[PDB]
Design a protein around this ligand. Structure first.
Ligand SMILES: CCC1=C(C)/C(=C/C2=NC(=C\c3[nH]c(/C=C4\NC(=O)[C@H](C)[C@H]4CC)c(C)c3CCC(=O)O)/C(CCC(=O)O)=C2C)NC1=O
Ligand SMILES: CCC1=C(C)/C(=C/C2=NC(=C\c3[nH]c(/C=C4\NC(=O)[C@H](C)[C@H]4CC)c(C)c3CCC(=O)O)/C(CCC(=O)O)=C2C)NC1=O
Ligand SMILES: CCC1=C(C)/C(=C/C2=NC(=C\c3[nH]c(/C=C4\NC(=O)[C@H](C)[C@H]4CC)c(C)c3CCC(=O)O)/C(CCC(=O)O)=C2C)NC1=O
Ligand SMILES: CCC1=C(C)/C(=C/C2=NC(=C\c3[nH]c(/C=C4\NC(=O)[C@H](C)[C@H]4CC)c(C)c3CCC(=O)O)/C(CCC(=O)O)=C2C)NC1=O
Ligand SMILES: CCC1=C(C)/C(=C/C2=NC(=C\c3[nH]c(/C=C4\NC(=O)[C@H](C)[C@H]4CC)c(C)c3CCC(=O)O)/C(CCC(=O)O)=C2C)NC1=O
Ligand SMILES: CCC1=C(C)/C(=C/C2=NC(=C\c3[nH]c(/C=C4\NC(=O)[C@H](C)[C@H]4CC)c(C)c3CCC(=O)O)/C(CCC(=O)O)=C2C)NC1=O
Ligand SMILES: CCC1=C(C)/C(=C/C2=NC(=C\c3[nH]c(/C=C4\NC(=O)[C@H](C)[C@H]4CC)c(C)c3CCC(=O)O)/C(CCC(=O)O)=C2C)NC1=O
Ligand SMILES: CCC1=C(C)/C(=C/C2=NC(=C\c3[nH]c(/C=C4\NC(=O)[C@H](C)[C@H]4CC)c(C)c3CCC(=O)O)/C(CCC(=O)O)=C2C)NC1=O
Ligand SMILES: CCC1=C(C)/C(=C\C2=NC(=C\c3[nH]c(/C=C4\NC(=O)[C@H](C)[C@H]4CC)c(C)c3CCC(=O)O)/C(CCC(=O)O)=C2C)NC1=O
Lengths: 160, 160, 106, 161, 92, 173, 160, 161, 161, 161, 160
């Protein structure tokens, strides 16, 4: 979290936090209860955002699922709805700890090489997350749409 | 400056500004008009702070104005308060910048070499800054006196 | 008790450590700069200033024999607390033995 | 390293669940007590040389370790010993700020006890100084901040035993 | 010449680790630790052994043992193989 | 580097004076556009991978000589994909370091980490400076398209991309 | 120690002691009787050197014994004189060992960190050693007072 | 580091004698099979990234390791997994070219069972990853040459457990 | 570096000659003054902080370079100023012991003028601080050793202009 | 390292005492025999090459050890042979000068028995080679000088078995 | 020189020389009268020490001057004795410099590479220096022949 970045950034200089570093912790800790309600709304719509986002990637990348691709099949499509319980789950972990570390320690680090083992077009998941951000905006108001917006872009920039 | 601190931290990681740094800069730009008020109150009350500040210093450390002390005489006591005016100036710089960087680069790096090569007790400069902080916090409201107290505190910790 | 007696032997060893210098500085001329006559500006040290006298007065005195003496006072507090605990334990044993010698079940 | 927030993130991540109601409850305790810890960490940073100076005097300057034949007799061993205490007081403030004692296992108690045993540093007298440092700091920051600081002073000692 | 010449806060030299070793100290430990890289997945440098057992001088054990901790390493054992214990003079 | 506040605070320290109204008016001009300088940086963060493709495509449509062989003078252009990959990497450096200076309100980060040593490196690899000045100016024209209604955001955006072209340029006049 | 310090410089290069280094060890053991005599002269004049040297210190530095000074109090003044007997004892070790390694390893390495943690002015400990150096040089011969002053001078340089 | 020919020379050298009749047949045996080894290492290097792709999918793909709580869960842990198999395959190729498994001791197994034990990596699963990779390689390089590559895979598994 | 002894040996060896009468007298000139140089070197090391402290007050302590705008204004620049003065005092003492200014060329003066021109340090004010430091030193060590020390103080100033 | 002078300074400093009569007697025991060690230390440094050449040929030269398959067979093993013997001779000369074998425990016998057992070096032969090196070195420095010399050769052999 | 090694050794630590290091310089300048006299006694016996030394070398090593040896012929034997004059000249420099550093920096650094390139047996140059040592040591007194022999034994050890 933001306190682990300040404590670590100061520890390698062998000092206590400064007047401006202690203010970074103060402002973040005072906005902790607004982040504690925002991620609860996301958890209530985890089953519905997939319903909107799954529609998007296949009409935009229909060549992935059709016969002629290698990984499609009636076998694996059963547990599809449980997917974003992992990725937008990390987006709830990042909305709580107000920084990019949970989205970067897990996820971004090693995600490209992870897929290159197969040969899958990595641009698909980059568009999968971009369409996911398109999905999370309709079930959420405009005021806190600016609050979860910068956390999605980091995933696109991290994968790219 | 807290802004400069957040741009060089993202530069080291070779990545763009993250959400944890973009809301911290928002907290600083949103708190700008309040810092310029506090920093301008210490600038308009320099005489009452430096003169009252040295007054209480000469009662906690009478040996600096005794025969043989460092600030003994009319011209050495005037140079005593010349230094309390330098450190009140650097504190206003640190309140406007949002961090203690201007204090560090000006009058905290190598401050022990300077006073040791002048013959001045370093514990007497820290005792004078602690007495200016009492007069300085009497002109401000309850919550603004806490904001300014962090910058006076950093100067004492570095001077010990 | 027998770690309070080890504290008293450390106080007796701390005074013998400094007694060649405690008596060697007893016939020196130690003149201060302020604090004694009122014609010299003393500042805070006209008396002592603003809360710095302490809860006792002996806690503001530094020294090897004052520091082992505060160890004695915290070690004698724990002995006196448990010596007053064997008093009312001895009361309840006698007040239950007065029930025994009175005609009862025991 | 993990603070109070990351502890629930590290926990929910391994089982793979979202944060539940009970997990949300303890985080409320950490967020509410935020400005309490930031104010305490500022006063400890200014009175750092004063907290160590009267904790050593209350603990070490009375015993026989400062006299000849004991540890921290020489100046080289007296400077090395008050250098350690400057680290214990700094890492204990990180724990109070982060709200979690995990940073003490990683960057304090990581190979430290085995170092003292070879060098011959008394482990019992080190606990006596960190314990004396606990009350001296408890008078500067108050009773509320003084109790949280005692959780990490007692943590350094329980792992150094 | 030695790390304890008084350099601390508010000095001209940057704040770093200070050792309690004398000039040309000759005490060495024998340590054992594991230290993962934690940065190979964005540099792509070669793979190296991270299980180390080596003799390290007294003059650098504070800095080394404090660097292994910052970088996530774990120290498994440490012993003094050269030097005396509580020696007043004779560490040079 | 130095942000706008540090530059004004350092200019007053050189005289040994406090901050008067003249120095506080300058700090207020940054605290006014400061909330708008973040909307510009958050837009670059979301469109960063798109703003570099279009700048690269529009550059090569006007300068088709860069995608062709180098000539016996071994000029370093985007001839092969090893060069094309390396030259698209540069276009990110201009975009990344230009987003920093838009939040700093000052070009101190630009010269201290981009311009000091740049012409020595491009003259060493024979990389053309002419086209490089163009693609820096194509990025400016593109990013200004998102901000068309209000024109106070155009001045803020043009500052980093104008400084790079004025300092990489050769003084012919 | 002259023998210890010249074996380390030959153990570094991994070679035997050269004829130049063995000639310096020879001229050291030849002066062994004279060094044992000078150390004996200081060892038996302890009270006079510590009593006379300390009395001069409290006349040149009255601030250490005035209210607020470090050596204020009868135990604080006696401990101030306990330190001067430490440095006098170490000087006899240095005269017998042929070098300042006994003085440096015991009471010169970390001396500034020590006295700063006690609140003692290091410029007052250096003034007390300078008052013992002339009281000790009046009790020795012409050539012995010159050799003894070298070890008192080295303790003055390392204490500034 | 030593291959087959330098091990047959060491046998006669440790007794100070010249290469007699029996020593050459062990030399001709490595020479006659020299072309079969170099043609196999050419096909392995060209299919390295794919040979690992099924070995992971053959044994460790649908297991609990890729799921939360197990090892290989996070992307950083998945990338380190497949990165380790690539070094096993390369060093297993070097050993087959040399015809002596000595190279696996110096530059592979020196501190490997201790490293994995400290991190928490499962030795049982990694043994299945190499046993999985050993079977697929026997199909590409062929039956005869496929067993030689297998002889150095089990050597890594035997000395790793 | 080379002292007065080695400077005589190199002058002879570069010709292939043994030490003749003209070089033997130079060797006697150094032995006769060896006890005077060791005596001055010990008094300078003990009064170094007061030689620098009084050369600074006399030359540049209340000048234009104290105040803002001038050089050595901030405490980090004041502290770097008196760190340069501690170089010249220590290296002028090495040259006085060796009786040869060779060490001032290699480890002090070689490329020192360009460093000050790039940093912006005034050379005229630096020469005045060394000259004020030459007068204070000449009063502590006497008139005979005092003019030896001034022999290597002028080598730095003339090697700096 | 601590010599005879430092070892008596240590015993006195741990009590806080000056150098008493029993201490000054041990110091005269070192000074009185000091110029005899300096003379014996130069005699062994001049005959170091022959003390080892005659000890090796007399002890382990035509032995099975130098034949094919033994230790010290290859030229590197032979060169490491005579490189070790000079290490002992050079360190036993450091101990005779200092009059205290403390330098042998830190820089020679620092876990040397485990290193020789792992490598397979015959400990029985190295002890007899050092002993053979004691009979030729003793005939050079005489009996009175050989007393302190042989005192450390037996320290290495006793600390090696 | 003894002075040079004391100044460079105290420069690596960035400090002044200690009293133990200055005593070695005082003890060395005191023996300057004896060193200048011993070097003079050798310089006056060049033709005898060199010719006498090369005469004994050709009896312990008769093959070097026979047909096939390196020094076969009058011109070659003349350059044979030329080398012995180099090391006798270097030995007089070491006796006067107070240490063997002139012998090392001139004619010992790279000596095995020089003589291996010229085809000269390095073992014969060390045998010829050992014969000059006996001749030079027969012209001196009891203790002056002992130290001068140490400078001849250092050259042979470094020549093997
Ligand atoms: C052998 C090397 C060596 C030294 C030097 C040494 C010093 C040393 N000085 C001490 C105290 C002290 N030292 C002083 C000294 C002074 N007050 C003044 O005004 C003067 C300027 C100065 C003496 C000249 C005082 C007042 C105390 C008591 C401080 C306290 O108890 O808070 C203490 C703590 C209590 C004690 O045991 O005395 C140590 C360990 N220890 C060592 O092992
Ligand atoms: C941040 C976590 C951390 C700590 C704490 C740490 C301690 C540490 N303490 C050391 C020594 C030491 N530590 C002490 C400490 C003490 N003496 C006493 O009497 C007291 C009981 C105690 C002070 C509380 C002494 C005297 C030495 C020197 C031992 C010697 O020289 O023999 C050393 C050996 C290196 C050196 O001294 O420079 C280390 C590495 N390292 C770490 O990474
Ligand atoms: C942060 C500031 C900064 C910049 C800008 C920077 C540039 C930079 N550009 C480089 C190469 C290069 N840059 C290009 C660029 C181009 N080719 C064209 O035709 C176009 C005009 C242009 C693309 C717009 C090419 C082709 C190379 C490789 C040249 C070669 O190897 O032949 C290299 C050498 C490769 C390396 O990085 O190791 C550096 C250092 N470094 C920095 O630190
Ligand atoms: C020597 C190895 C090598 C090759 C081949 C290479 C190709 C290369 N092809 C490119 C573009 C392109 N390449 C193609 C097309 C194709 N490409 C094909 O190999 C197919 C035959 C065909 C598709 C069927 C197209 C349409 C573009 C333009 C894409 C764009 O507008 O960005 C570009 C970008 C600049 C440009 O030419 O417009 C490079 C550097 N570079 C190299 O170093
Ligand atoms: C040449 C011989 C050699 C090997 C093999 C080697 C391995 C090695 N594996 C490592 C980590 C690792 N290795 C794994 C491996 C696995 N996880 C699983 O689930 C699988 C069962 C298994 C792979 C088959 C994981 C997950 C880590 C990271 C652990 C962590 O980050 O907590 C690390 C720490 C450095 C880093 O992760 O960047 C090294 C040095 N080093 C060597 O020198
Ligand atoms: C902006 C950062 C900064 C500071 C702080 C600074 C200090 C500074 N303090 C000085 C003197 C002095 N400073 C003092 C100060 C004191 N006497 C006491 O008793 C008190 C404890 C203490 C003040 C609270 C005295 C008495 C002098 C004159 C000393 C002398 O002339 O010998 C001087 C020398 C005269 C001059 O050039 O002005 C400088 C440069 N310079 C800087 O650039
Ligand atoms: C300074 C203190 C010190 C010692 C003593 C020391 C010993 C030491 N002896 C070694 C090897 C050796 N030691 C011997 C020794 C012997 N062979 C025999 O027949 C005899 C019994 C015996 C003595 C002549 C041989 C033959 C080797 C080579 C082993 C190999 O190359 O595998 C090695 C391995 C490094 C190498 O190959 O050179 C070390 C480190 N290192 C030290 O730092
Ligand atoms: C100051 C240090 C130093 C040395 C020692 C030195 C040696 C040196 N020896 C030489 C030749 C030679 N050196 C020898 C030496 C020998 N023949 C024997 O039988 C003996 C074993 C042996 C020693 C007397 C011979 C025969 C030559 C001439 C080789 C030839 O002409 O083929 C030459 C080439 C011709 C010349 O320039 O004189 C040099 C430079 N130069 C130096 O600067
Ligand atoms: C942060 C959470 C996390 C994940 C997910 C992960 C690993 C992971 N999940 C994967 C596939 C996956 N592939 C699919 C299905 C598909 N793939 C798609 O992009 C479409 C939706 C569909 C096309 C057919 C699903 C649902 C998973 C996740 C688990 C599984 O079902 O295998 C793959 C590709 C290779 C494989 O295992 O088969 C990896 C490496 N590591 C992690 O740390």
């Amino acid at each position: 979290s933001l306190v682990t970045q300040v404590i670590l950034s100061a520890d390698d200089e062998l000092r206590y936090p400064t007047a401006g570093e202690l203010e970074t912790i103060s402002s973040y800790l005072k906005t902790g209860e607004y982040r504690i309600r925002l991620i609860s709304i996301l958890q209530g719509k985890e089953q519905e955002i997939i319903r909107l986002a799954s529609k998007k990637i296949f009409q935009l990348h229909p060549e992935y699922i059709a016969p002629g691709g290698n990984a499609s099949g009636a076998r694996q499509r059963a547990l599809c709805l449980r997917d974003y319980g992992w990725y937008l789950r990390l987006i709830t972990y990042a909305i709580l700890a107000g920084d990019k570390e949970p989205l970067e320690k897990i996820g971004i680090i090693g995600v490209r090489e992870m897929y290159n083992s197969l040969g899958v077009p990595i641009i698909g998941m980059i568009d999968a997350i971009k369409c996911l951000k398109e999905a999370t905006v309709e079930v959420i108001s405009q005021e806190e749409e600016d609050f979860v917006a910068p956390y999605y872009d980091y995933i696109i920039q991290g994968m790219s | 400056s807290i802004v400069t601190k957040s741009i060089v931290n993202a530069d080291a990681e070779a990545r763009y500004l993250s959400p944890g740094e973009l809301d911290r800069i928002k907290s600083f730009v949103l708190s700008g008009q309040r810092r310029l008020r506090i920093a301008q109150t210490l600038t308009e009350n320099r005489e009452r702070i430096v003169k009252q500040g040295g007054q209480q210093l000469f009662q906690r450390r009478p040996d600096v104005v005794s025969p043989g002390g460092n600030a003994y005489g009319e011209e050495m006591t005037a140079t005593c308060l010349r230094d309390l005016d330098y450190y009140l100036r650097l504190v206003t710089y640190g309140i406007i910048a949002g961090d203690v960087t201007p204090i560090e680069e000006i009058g905290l790096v190598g401050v022990k070499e300077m006073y040791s090569a002048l013959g001045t007790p370093i514990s007497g400069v820290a005792e004078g800054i602690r007495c200016m902080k009492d007069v300085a916090c009497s002109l401000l409201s309850g919550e603004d006196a806490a904001e300014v107290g962090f910058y006076f505190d950093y100067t004492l910790a570095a001077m010990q | 008790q027998i770690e309070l007696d080890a504290a008293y032997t450390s106080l007796a060893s701390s005074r013998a450590f400094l007694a060649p210098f405690a008596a060697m500085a007893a016939d020196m001329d130690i003149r201060p700069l302020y604090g004694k006559n009122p014609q010299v500006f003393a500042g805070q040290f006209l008396g002592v200033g603003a809360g710095q006298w302490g809860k006792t007065g002996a806690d503001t005195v530094r020294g090897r024999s004052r520091r082992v003496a505060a160890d004695i006072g915290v070690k004698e507090f724990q002995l006196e607390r448990v010596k007053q605990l064997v008093v009312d334990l001895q009361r309840a044993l006698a007040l239950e033995d007065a029930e025994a010698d009175a005609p009862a079940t025991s | 390293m993990q603070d109070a927030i990351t502890s629930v993130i590290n926990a929910a991540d391994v089982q793979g669940k979202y944060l539940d109601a009970n997990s949300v409850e303890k985080l409320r305790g950490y967020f509410q007590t935020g400005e309490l810890r930031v104010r305490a960490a500022a006063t400890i940073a200014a009175n750092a040389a004063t907290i160590i100076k009267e904790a050593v005097a209350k603990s070490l300057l009375y015993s026989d370790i400062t006299r000849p034949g004991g540890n921290m007799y020489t100046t080289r061993r007296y400077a090395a010993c008050i250098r350690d205490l400057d680290y214990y007081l700094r890492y204990a403030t990180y724990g109070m700020l982060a709200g979690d004692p995990s940073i003490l296992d990683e960057r304090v108690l990581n190979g430290l006890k085995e170092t003292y045993n070879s060098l011959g540093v008394p482990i019992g007298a080190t606990i006596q100084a960190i314990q004396a440092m606990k009350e001296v700091t408890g008078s500067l920051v108050g009773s509320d901040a003084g109790k949280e600081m005692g959780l990490y002073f007692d943590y350094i000692c329980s792992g150094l035993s | 010449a030695y790390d304890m010449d008084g350099t601390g806060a508010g000095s001209l030299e940057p704040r770093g680790i200070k050792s309690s070793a004398v000039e040309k100290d000759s005490r060495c430990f024998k340590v054992t630790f594991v230290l993962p890289s934690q940065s190979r997945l964005y540099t792509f440098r070669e793979l190296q052994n991270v299980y180390t057992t080596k003799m390290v001088p007294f003059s650098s054990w504070y800095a080394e043992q404090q660097r292994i901790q910052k970088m996530g390493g774990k120290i498994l054992k440490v012993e003094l193989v050269a030097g005396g214990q509580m020696r007043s003079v004779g560490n040079q | 580097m130095q942000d706008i506040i540090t530059s004004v605070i350092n200019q007053y320290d050189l005289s040994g004076r406090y901050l008067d109204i003249k120095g506080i008016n300058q700090i207020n001009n940054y605290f006014d556009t400061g909330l708008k300088r973040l909307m510009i940086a958050k837009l670059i963060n979301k469109e960063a991978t798109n703003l570099i493709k279009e700048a690269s495509e529009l550059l090569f449509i006007e300068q088709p000589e860069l995608l062709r062989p180098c000539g016996n003078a071994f000029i370093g252009n985007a001839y092969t994909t090893r060069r094309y990959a390396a030259c698209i990497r540069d276009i990110e450096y201009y975009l990344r370091y230009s987003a920093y200076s838009i939040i700093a309100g000052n070009n101190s980060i630009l010269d201290e980490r981009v311009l000091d040593g740049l012409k020595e490196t491009y003259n060493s690899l024979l990389v053309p400076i002419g086209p490089t000045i163009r693609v820096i100016q194509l990025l400016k024209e593109i990013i200004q398209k998102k901000f068309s209604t209000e024109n106070i955001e155009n001045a803020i955006i043009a500052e980093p991309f104008d400084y790079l072209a004025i300092n990489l340029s050769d003084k012919n006049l």
